């Protein structure tokens, strides 16, 4: 397998197939994995971007996860004041298998070649979970906060989804 984008090493994670061929996918277990340490001997660590609007994440989200769902946002908090260390991981996830976690996964990736030499990298190591927050709370629902699952298309929250799809940088 290739070495992590600056070319210093390997991924660290097991990888699972995804639908973005150039993009790596990780299963919930090896999030949890994550989560629980199994990595704090090589993790410094690592940011969970939650990549879906405001109603969905407060209505549950992964425990530590940011919410970051507008580009300039996710720039901001990133790459203004990088996260420095062993490893820095960033996760990259939407609601299942949408375009929302793997368009913010280039983008970080496009703007911290930008503001660096090639091919160092703030964030060379980078992955997407696996079917998202839907695939995830059913396996692990006390590794989210609050232990409940809101969908992008709910019923009670159309208005919102149009409010906030206006907040974006392009559709
Ligand atoms: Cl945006």
């Known amino acids: 397998m290739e070495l992590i984008g600056?070319?210093?090493k390997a991924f660290?994670?097991?990888?699972?197939?995804?639908?973005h061929q150039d993009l790596?996918?990780?299963?919930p277990e090896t999030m949890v994995?994550?989560?629980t340490g199994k990595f704090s001997n090589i993790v410094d660590k690592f940011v969970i971007v939650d990549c879906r609007y405001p109603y969905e994440y407060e209505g549950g989200h992964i425990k530590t996860?940011?919410?970051?769902?507008?580009?300039?946002d996710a720039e901001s908090?990133?790459?203004?004041?990088?996260?420095?260390?062993?490893?820095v991981i960033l996760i990259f996830h939407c609601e299942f298998s949408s375009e929302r976690g793997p368009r913010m996964c280039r983008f970080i990736r496009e703007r911290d070649?930008?503001?660096?030499?090639?091919?160092?990298?703030?964030?060379?190591?980078?992955?997407?979970?696996?079917?998202?927050?839907?695939?995830?709370?059913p396996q692990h629902p006390?590794?989210?906060?609050?232990?409940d699952y809101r969908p992008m298309n709910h019923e009670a929250f159309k208005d919102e989804l149009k409010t906030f799809r206006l907040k974006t940088r392009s559709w």
């Open 142 to 147: 006390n590794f989210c906060e609050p232990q």
């Open 65 to 72: 996860a940011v919410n970051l769902p507008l580009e300039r």
């Open 12 to 19: 660290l994670l097991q990888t699972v197939d995804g639908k």
């Open 77 to 87: 908090f990133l790459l203004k004041s990088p996260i420095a260390p062993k490893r």
């Open 6 to 8: 600056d070319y210093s």
């Open 24 to 27: 790596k996918y990780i299963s």
């Open 33 to 35: 994995a994550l989560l």
């Open 113 to 137: 070649r930008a503001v660096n030499d090639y091919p160092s990298l703030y964030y060379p190591e980078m992955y997407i979970l696996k079917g998202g927050y839907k695939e995830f709370f």
